[PDB]
Paper text:
To our knowledge, the best known system that exemplifies this paradigm is the antibiotic agrocin 84, which penetrates into the cytoplasm of the bacterial pathogen Agrobacterium tumefaciens strain C58 by hijacking the PBP called AccA and its cognate transporter. We identified the pyranose-2-phosphate-like moiety shared by these two ligands as the key recognition template for AccA.
The unliganded AccA structure solved at 1.7 Å resolution adopts an open conformation. Indeed, superposition with the liganded structures results in an average rmsd of 1.5 Å for all Cα atoms and structural comparisons show that upon ligand binding, a 12° rotation around an axis defined by the two hinge residues, Met292 and Tyr493, leads to a similar closed form of the protein. The biggest lobe (lobe 1) consists of residues 29–280 and 494–521 and the smallest (lobe 2) comprises the residues 285–489.
Residue numbers in the entry: 31 to 521
The structure:
């Protein structure tokens, strides 16, 4: 009786294990299979899909015990897809040293420790009561359990299969259950009619890879898909010309950037990094490539940070004259500097780079584009400049400045950023402090240091574009995922 939902997608994750699925392509699938203790209600109080309000989900209630622990009271009679009732043991296993953050878990979940809080082992109080703890103070537990790191897995089934096999046959408590995974082709899910929350409205959901955007668009016009993903503002005109189709767009909690291999001689010091950063004309790029729909943030600072968003911050500096001076006073000899890009994996990456190459030519820096295929990122030492993006995954400023740019992150450890000691000291403080003047000011000083050092250069917050049949009602949310709970209906 319910319609089957057909999605034309850009790609699929290599695993359906919820943490290993973290990417631009995984969350739209794993958000259906699993649930979290606390859920973010993006549509709360009439918000246009960007609210940061947190509501009960698998946890009916919770109570903070002290500076490092929160006791959760679980919803009762919740069923995993295989008919196993959800208990405190499943939640304890989800946040355990064994599965997630411990030294053994590292080979199974590569970002398990990197993206997690400083967890201590959870405590099971009774069948429906579990306490999550951190080894050092953390006022981020509640916020973290509403994030993409926190989908609840079943203990017994996950242990039996192991992380790899679980990723190929996942079981969760979510509104849709697993049917099929054809690697590099399609994922099929079916309605979980035992779901504890709003009943699924589609009988089935198929995530079909259609690699090229023009082919994805043709698929929607051909009547092959109900919703297609990964379009840009340039597609709006064509789609909306069809009486039965329309685009649905939103800014997402992510930023596009370029960064440097600071192990390379030319990028060890901040001089040329700053020169390149100061020559980036973001307003022209936003108008030219995004139809003014992308947003230029005032620093490493986004509205989803909530209490740690600073709406009064000064804009990131644009100064061609200073940029020219810096190149001249730096060691820079005019030798071409490479900038690696995985084609247009980041929307508009190649035209954005063409524009920046001209801005850089004008200050006396010769930058050359280099492309690579998926899974072929070059050996680190063969790279100089490269593009990147970071999904801002917490309703708090902790992510991604601390896990990516902090003392434990890849920018310093793999990419050679020798961050000022003050920056690392502040990363530690914001990790352990509650919200207040000290934590708020620490993020602003970290944002200032980030701009002064230029280990990366923020371009903008992208504007994601979907296209859909007008008969299929579904609203985008401000994140790299698709939400169907109370947000998918047909007719």
């Amino acid at each position: 009786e319910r319609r089957a939902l057909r999605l034309g997608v850009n790609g699929l994750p290599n695993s359906l294990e919820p943490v290993n699925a973290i990417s631009n392509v995984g969350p739209r699938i794993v958000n259906q299979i699993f649930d979290t203790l606390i859920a973010r209600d993006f549509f709360a109080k009439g918000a246009p899909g960007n609210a940061i309000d947190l509501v009960p989900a698998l946890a009916e209630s919770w109570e903070r015990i002290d500076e490092k622990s929160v006791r959760f009271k679980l919803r009762q009679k919740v069923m995993f897809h295989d008919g196993v009732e959800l208990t405190a043991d499943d939640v304890a296993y989800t946040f355990s040293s064994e599965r997630l953050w411990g030294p053994e878990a590292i080979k199974k979940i590569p970002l398990g420790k990197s993206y997690s809080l400083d967890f201590d082992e959870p405590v099971v109080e009774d069948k429906y009561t579990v306490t999550l703890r951190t080894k050092t103070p953390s006022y981020l537990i509640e916020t973290f359990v509403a994030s993409w790191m926190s989908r609840i897995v079943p203990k017994e089934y996950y242990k039996k299969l192991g992380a790899v096999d679980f990723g190929n046959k996942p079981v969760g408590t979510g509104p849709y259950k697993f049917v099929e995974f054809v690697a590099g082709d399609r994922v099929v899910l079916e309605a979980n009619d035992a779901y504890w929350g709003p009943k699924p409205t589609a009988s089935k959901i198929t995530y079909q890879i259609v690699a090229e955007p023009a082919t994805r668009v043709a698929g929607l016009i051909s009547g092959e898909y109900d919703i297609i993903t990964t379009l840009t503002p340039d597609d709006i005109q064509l789609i909306n010309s069809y009486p039965d189709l329309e685009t649905r767009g939103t800014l997402i909690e992510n930023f596009h950037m370029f960064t440097f291999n600071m192990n390379q001689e030319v990028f060890k010091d901040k001089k040329l990094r700053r020169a390149l950063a100061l020559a980036v004309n973001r307003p022209i790029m936003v108008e030219a490539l995004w139809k003014k729909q992308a947003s230029i943030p005032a620093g490493f600072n986004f509205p989803n940070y909530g209490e740690t968003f600073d709406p009064k911050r000064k804009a990131m500096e644009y100064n061609v004259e200073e940029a020219k001076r810096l190149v001249k006073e730096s060691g820079y000899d005019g030798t071409p500097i490479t900038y690696h890009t995985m084609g247009n994996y980041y929307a508009n990456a190649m035209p954005a780079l063409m524009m920046m190459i001209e801005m850089w030519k004008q200050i006396g820096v010769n930058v050359v584009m280099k492309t690579y295929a998926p899974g072929s990122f070059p050996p680190d030492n063969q790279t100089w400049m490269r593009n990147w993006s970071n999904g801002q995954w917490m309703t708090d400023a902790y992510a991604t400045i601390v896990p990516e740019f902090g003392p434990n992150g890849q920018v310093q450890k793999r990419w050679g950023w020798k961050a000022p000691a003050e920056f690392n000291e502040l990363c530690q403080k914001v990790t352990v402090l509650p919200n207040g003047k000290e934590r708020f000011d620490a993020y602003n000083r970290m944002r200032d240091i980030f701009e002064e050092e230029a280990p990366a250069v923020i371009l903008y917050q992208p504007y994601d574009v979907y296209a859909a049949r007008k008969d299929v009602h579904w609203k985008p949310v401000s994140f790299e995922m698709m939400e169907f709970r109370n947000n998918l209906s047909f007719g």
